[PDB]
Design a protein around this nucleic acid. Structure first.
Ligand SMILES: Nc1ncnc2c1ncn2[C@@H]1O[C@H](COP(=O)(O)OP(=O)(O)OP(O)(O)=S)[C@@H](O)[C@H]1O
Ligand SMILES: Nc1ncnc2c1ncn2[C@@H]1O[C@H](COP(=O)(O)OP(=O)(O)OP(O)(O)=S)[C@@H](O)[C@H]1O
Ligand SMILES: [Mg+2]
Ligand SMILES: [Mg+2]
Lengths: 333, 223
DNA sequence: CCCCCCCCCCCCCCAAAAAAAAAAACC
């Protein structure tokens, strides 16, 4: 009796909302395909496992922060490279004014199709992001350092002049404006951030990021990247031993971590990861310092094992196949 | 939480504000009540909602383009008499239409605070008649310069503090570990405002990732 | 029977927003 009157009042209101605002303005969550989480590869297999859903989520904001020369630009370019191989359009907003195009090419970026901008102000940087996001034609946008997003009042002013919370206010306003445009267009926005010190603070970690508190709330993923050591060919330092900690995650469980190598002029060592995951999943046998695949001695030392997997593409296809099928916790489709 | 009233849940990032409001919805759906989620942040995962026990197929959802549209849908569902619980995920993301149409850098002094002041006036009465519970999630921001009181603020001006019948401050106070694997969060909720009973009481519980609030953990501690 | 003539005066505000950054040996 009342069931029916409530169902009619509901149907009428849903009708009036859809009339006033448009077709998909309100609906049942179970029948809204828009709100399914789609992902892209990061270029690292250990990071795709740590993210739980197999990569970074489309239509969302991501933050990548860390100390000096930890691999923040290298990691974001490998994301772009992987997205371009899947026929997506990418854009780089270079507020730091420090991108080497030859090095981007060596990491596998198609630089003749990468949109690049070196904007004068933080307001111009963020207005280009909103213009590209509304277009529906760009899939991935990277903004290199939040720290270099200078407000126009600060650019026009003198050195020593105080601009209290002006950049924090610009970042608050930009998040409000962008979150909805990105979700509609299904665009991924990645912010890189630098670290600074808080002083006068309680016993919590004194490390902070720039541009205030808004971005911490609006980000669906936050990644802390750190150089934890060196990779040596005898004496020559040839690369960096890297750790990525997942510090926030809204698409899967957080506080997982990834270890991988960045090799100078190649990027992320994909086969180096595929060894370590083949070991952990009992598909490669490491007897002391002798790696073995089904009895066959693939090599001695991780570098020789990696070199073996390079010249056997069939064995690398097979191990990738299994590791993918086993270890991904939240596969989408 | 009282029916026909406004509730505010605020706290820092990844403190459990969305998880908490989905467990309210879940519990209400089990007592045959209709619920709605206005997702202004554009950051709800339907699979995670299903794992906390929400019936996804009966949960009304909206991802509104403006703050005005979001609050017009709240007033439309309030007047219907058909919806029992509404959640508005983040007051912070309720952007005025002028700010959306405008450029980044443009000043809109107290435009969001005005919208929120106007919204409360309109909503308070409509919610009481319908016996509808409205829950506002809020983010924290820092007050700077010459400060009278604590420098932690909430977004969207001063109206919502007055109109709210309950205000909850939620915080993550530590990790829950299965040896090495971090499997959940130790949580604290302070009742900072209460009009339906005495305030300043607090609750401590565990949020386990993929399950939600650990009911049996609470039952030990209360036992 | 016959024919119209002319204007007068204002009234009330509404709402916050946001961090930034190390410095230094001592025997
Ligand atoms: N053009 C290049 N050629 C060779 N090695 C490079 C080049 N650019 C960067 N690297 C190295 O790659 C590693 C990671 O560099 P990036 O990815 O540029 O780190 P980053 O965190 O962006 O550091 P910033 O922006 O300079 S604080 C470092 O050890 C660099 O020296
Ligand atoms: N989809 C998910 N799967 C597993 N764990 C999750 C998921 N979403 C959130 N969590 C975890 O549950 C805890 C509380 O998350 P939320 O309920 O999203 O908190 P919140 O205050 O809404 O944070 P925001 O909106 O991102 S500032 C966090 O430690 C999350 O990492
Ligand atoms: Mg860089
Ligand atoms: Mg939330």
């Amino acid at each position: 009796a009342i069931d029916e009157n409530k169902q009619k009042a509901l149907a009428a209101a849903l009708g009036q909302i859809e009339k006033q605002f448009g077709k998909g303005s309100i609906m049942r969550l179970g029948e809204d395909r828009s709100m399914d989480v789609e992902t892209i590869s990061t270029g690292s297999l250990s990071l795709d496992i740590a993210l739980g859903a197999g990569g970074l989520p489309m239509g969302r904001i991501v933050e990548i922060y860390g100390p000096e020369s930890s691999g923040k630009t290298t990691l974001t370019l490998q994301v772009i490279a992987a997205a371009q191989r899947e026929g997506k359009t990418c854009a780089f907003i270079d507020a730091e004014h420090a991108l080497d195009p030859i090095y981007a090419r060596k990491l596998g970026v198609d630089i003749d199709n990468l949109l690049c901008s070196q904007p004068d102000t933080g307001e111009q940087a963020l207005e280009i992001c909103d213009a590209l996001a509304r277009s529906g034609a760009v899939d991935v946008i990277v903004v290199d350092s939040v720290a270099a997003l200078t407000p126009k009042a600060e650019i026009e002013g003198e050195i020593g002049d105080s601009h209290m919370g002006l950049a924090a206010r610009m970042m608050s306003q930009a998040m409000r404006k962008l979150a909805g445009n990105l979700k509609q267009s299904n665009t991924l926005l990645i912010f890189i951030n630098q670290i600074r010190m808080k002083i006068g603070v309680m016993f919590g970690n004194p490390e902070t990021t720039t541009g205030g508190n808004a971005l911490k709330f609006y980000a669906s993923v936050r990644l802390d990247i750190r150089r934890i050591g060196a990779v040596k060919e005898g004496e020559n330092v040839v690369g960096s031993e890297t750790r990525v900690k997942v510090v926030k995650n809204k698409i899967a469980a957080p506080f997982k971590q990834a270890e991988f190598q960045i090799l100078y002029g190649e990027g992320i060592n994909f086969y180096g990861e595929l060894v370590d995951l083949g070991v952990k999943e009992k598909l490669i046998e490491k007897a002391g310092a002798w790696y073995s695949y089904k009895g066959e001695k693939i090599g001695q030392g991780k570098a020789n094992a990696t070199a073996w997997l390079k010249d056997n593409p069939e064995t690398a296809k097979e191990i990738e196949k299994k590791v993918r099928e086993l270890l991904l916790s939240n596969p989408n489709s």
